[PDB]
Design a protein around this ligand. Structure first.
Ligand SMILES: O=C1Oc2ccccc2C12CCN(c1nc3c(c(=O)[nH]1)CCCC3)CC2
Ligand SMILES: [Zn+2]
Lengths: 162, 47
C-alpha cells in the first residue's frame, strides 16, 4: 500500500525538511558514542510516504484525541530513528516499535533534535554501528530517519535530569 | 506498551539540566503517529 514520492532538492518542501534536520543537530553527552561525531548531515534523498490506509488510521485517531482535548490535536512534526524504518513506512507504528526501557515508560519515542533520533538508526545506543563497517560514526553508509506527524493531545509534562 | 498517564494522550520529556537539549515525546498508541517523510542521509565528518 505504501508509495514513496521523491521530492526535488529544488522544491521548497525538500529545503524546509532539510532545514529542520540540519538546524536541530546538537552535541550529545556521550561525546558521539552512539550516533557518531558530526555537526551536519549530507542529505541524499527526502521521500514523502503515501499510504491511504495508514493516513486514515492516523487521522481517525487524531480526530478522537482532538475531541478529548478542548478541540486541540496538539500535532507536532518530530523525528524518529529506528532499525525498523522499513517496517514502519509499510505497516505503520505499533507496540513492537516501542522502547520498553525508555525513561518515560514503554512507548514510541520521538525527538525534536534530529541528532537524538540519529542515535537510534542502528539500534539502542547505536547498536554495533553500521552493518558494513560496524562503525557507529560511519561517514560512508547511508542512514535513514523519519520526520513524523505526531498527535500529542493533552501531554503529561515530565521534567528529566538530562 | 504502557498506558499514558490518566487523562493524558502522551508524555513530554523535557530536559531540565542541559538547556540546549530539546524535548522528547512518547505516545502509547501506534495510530498517533504517521511517518510522513523518509530522509536518507550521511553524517559528515567535521572540517
Ligand atoms: O532503537 C531501537 O531499537 C529497538 C529495538 C527493538 C524495539 C524498539 C527499538 C528502538 C528503541 C528506541 N527508538 C528511539 N528512541 C528514541 C528516539 C528515537 O527516534 N527512536 C528519540 C528520543 C529518544 C528515544 C527506536 C526503536
Ligand atoms: Zn559503514
Amino acid at each position: 500500500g505504501t508509495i514513496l514520492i521523491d521530492l526535488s532538492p529544488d522544491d521548497k518542501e525538500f529545503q524546509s525538511v532539510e532545514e529542520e534536520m540540519q538546524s536541530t543537530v546538537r552535541e550529545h553527552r556521550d561525546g558521539g558514542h552512539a550516533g557518531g561525531i558530526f555537526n551536519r548531515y549530507n542529505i541524499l534523498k527526502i521521500q514523502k510516504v503515501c499510504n491511504k490506509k495508514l493516513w486514515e488510521r492516523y487521522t481517525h485517531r487524531r480526530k478522537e484525541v482532538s475531541e478529548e482535548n478542548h478541540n486541540h490535536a496538539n500535532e507536532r512534526m518530530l523525528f524518529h530513528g529506528s532499525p525498523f524504518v522499513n517496517a514502519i513506512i509499510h505497516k505503520g507504528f505499533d507496540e513492537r516499535h516501542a522502547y520498553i526501557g525508555g525513561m518515560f515508560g514503554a512507548g514510541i519515542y520521538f525527538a525534536e533534535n534530529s541528532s537524538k533520533s540519529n542515535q537510534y538508526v542502528y539500534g539502542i545506543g547505536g547498536g554495533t554501528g553500521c552493518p558494513v563497517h560496524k562503525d557507529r560514526s560511519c561517514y560512508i553508509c547511508h542512514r535513514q530517519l523519519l520526520f513524523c506527524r505526531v498527535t500529542l493531545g493533552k501531554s503529561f509534562l515530565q521534567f528529566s535530569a538530562m | 506498551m504502557a498506558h499514558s498517564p490518566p487523562g493524558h494522550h502522551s508524555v513530554t520529556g523535557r530536559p531540565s539540566v542541559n538547556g540546549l537539549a530539546l524535548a522528547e515525546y512518547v505516545i502509547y498508541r501506534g495510530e498517533q503517529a504517521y511517518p510522513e517523510y523518509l530522509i536518507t542521509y550521511q553524517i559528515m565528518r567535521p572540517e
